[PDB]
Amino acid sequence: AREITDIKQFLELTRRADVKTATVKINKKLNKAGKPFRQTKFKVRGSSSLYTLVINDAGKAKKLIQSLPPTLKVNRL
The rounded distance, in Å, linking the Cα atoms of 61 and 39 is 9
- Least spacing, CB of residue 13 vs RNA, in Å: 9
The rounded distance, in Å, linking the Cα atoms of 45 and 34 is 32
| Closer residue to RNA, CB minimum distance, 11 or 46 | 46
- Least spacing, CB of residue 46 vs RNA, in Å: 4
* Binding-site member from 7, 11, 50, 55 for RNA (CB under 7 A): 50
- Yes or no: say if 44 and 65 are a contact pair by the CB < 8 Å rule: no
* 10: helix, strand or coil: helix
Catalog residues that contact RNA under the rule CB under 7 A.
1-3, 16, 18, 23, 25, 27, 41, 43, 46-50, 52, 54, 75
